[PDB]
Amino acid sequence: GSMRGKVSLEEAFELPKFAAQTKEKAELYIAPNNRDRYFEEILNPCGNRLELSNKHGIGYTIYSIYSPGPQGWTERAECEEYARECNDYISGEIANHKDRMGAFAALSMHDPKQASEELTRCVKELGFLGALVNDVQHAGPEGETHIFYDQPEWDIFWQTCVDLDVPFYLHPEPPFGSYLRNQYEGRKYLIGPPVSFANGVSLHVLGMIVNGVFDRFPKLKVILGHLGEHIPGDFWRIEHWFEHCSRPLAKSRGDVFAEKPLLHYFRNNIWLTTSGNFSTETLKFCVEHVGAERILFSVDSPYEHIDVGCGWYDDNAKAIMEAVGGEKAYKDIGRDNAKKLFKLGKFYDSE
Amino acid sequence: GSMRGKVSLEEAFELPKFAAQTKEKAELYIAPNNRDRYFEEILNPCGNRLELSNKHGIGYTIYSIYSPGPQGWTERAECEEYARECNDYISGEIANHKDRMGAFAALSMHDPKQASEELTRCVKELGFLGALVNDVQHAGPEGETHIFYDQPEWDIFWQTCVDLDVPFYLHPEPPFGSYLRNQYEGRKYLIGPPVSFANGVSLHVLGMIVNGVFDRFPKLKVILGHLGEHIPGDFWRIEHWFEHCSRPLAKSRGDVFAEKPLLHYFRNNIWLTTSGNFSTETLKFCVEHVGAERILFSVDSPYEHIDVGCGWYDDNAKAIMEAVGGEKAYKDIGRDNAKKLFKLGKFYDSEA
């Protein structure tokens, strides 16, 4: 039996006044027959995508800025203003649907203190449930500076996430600059879900792990989409290499390295979602490694179709239950894991 | 239920006269307690690594140049000379152990025709079994030029692979240039097996797929190590995206795109090895998608330890057999898949 009240939390929007920027994303990610729907959905949080969510048994949608969003704005002052405008916009949109909509903060990640202050404003003044940031922050007068969040200056930001007790969703973004030119110009259809997205996110979150972010902040919560961005299939190989090479080599140099086994972080600090990965077999493999309580349903609208993602979870209920360990596990992944993680009250169809 | 006669084919060496270059690789990939063993193995194809292979039930080792090898030599003329010297060296070393050693060609990949000629020389004159190339060929200052083999000029090379009927093993290599600086300087321990290696190989082989290489050369054979370099866990997502976005978008523009589903290529053109991935659970997942006949045992010596890789496969024989679908599947992965793919005749312990 399928369920209603599902929680979906990798659902993107853009500011309506930047509709022209969304045509550029459409040329990277949207087939011609899907263009009309994409443009309507990405610019209207309360439009047809809400009607489809109601029809297909979603109880609570958490909205976030699309990609790269602020992470593609290389001038700090403009970036900070854009992020604020995104947060004020989506706060106004979700205001009329409090029983079935929430939001993640959009952030400028040029400066850790400023990002901490905007996250605090979103959570404590606007009721947002976390942050969603599109991989590395690009910067400089030519856009080549790549700002990663696994370096020590970001500790003030991680402390803010822990103080607010909200998660950080690390979302992918397309290649930029020389990386785009050198490695993707001759294979442009690999920009996005086929490989480039997960290549970047996996690099970044493994960076957080090996640079000790979760050792310094054991209560930090991070979310990865797409069933973990290539990492679960490599759980054995990565941990093996850390044991065989990386940990003793770093120790011999006095270099910082992760204190715990790889799977510790994926069983304590990291949650996965099913965004764009409507795969019962891949879901099963992930459940077997991280536990059914650590995986959250999500669609990845508007790049994926709500009816398709919900159709997978709903229409294959019996097979998915068998794969993930029974009825409670199935309802946990669909709804109750996220209900507990985000401390959601009663919401639309939640019981 | 363990077996002897296993075939292992991601086994690297370096030219003895470049022993000093192996110090740089040791600083990236080798823990201090393993340095003495690494240096002995990487420079001695017939040394202790052969004694370990005999002890641990390997029947046939296919040697290849380590990484980046020629792919890091940015000057074409020097690169071509180095690749030739590698091939002549290893041909001489394996000559004294023909029942249990073979080799893959090292190639300069600056020029498709020149690489085709050196592969032909290795196969037809030296008896080599295929080519092993460490991802993109670097050129230019600091290696900033990335030469990919999924562009149309490379069809002359793929036609040669098909003419010779030998496989192409696409192995990883470290980051170079601005990519190394921008994306790895603050997380240097992720260079290598933790993520950077598979990030590059998966991009490159998916590039071959989406640029139609296997549609134009349906008989081409490609090998990937490390149980497929992140791709199997994403089989569903990649094919879904090709159906939902990439294929109709490319078709609307008249752009080349893969004609068949992703799994067709992984069931017809591509084989996986277990190099550096002694994981029964990951092996099971791969078998369930591509078939036990398309996965080959391998160790990835000297970066991995022969006793460890063979120990996994041998000591867990019963559990692995159950995971991969029985005794024939287990012996296929250990030995007989590679025996048939490389047309190996009788070899050491080959009927064990």
Ligand SMILES: O=C(O)c1ccccc1O
């Ligand atoms: O994960 C996303 O939001 C995304 C963004 C662009 C294209 C495809 C996608 O899945």
Ligand SMILES: O=C(O)c1ccccc1O
């Ligand atoms: O797989 C390899 O041969 C390899 C090459 C360079 C570094 C680490 C490695 O495992």
Ligand SMILES: [Zn+2]
């Ligand atoms: Zn998304």
Ligand SMILES: [Zn+2]
């Ligand atoms: Zn190797």
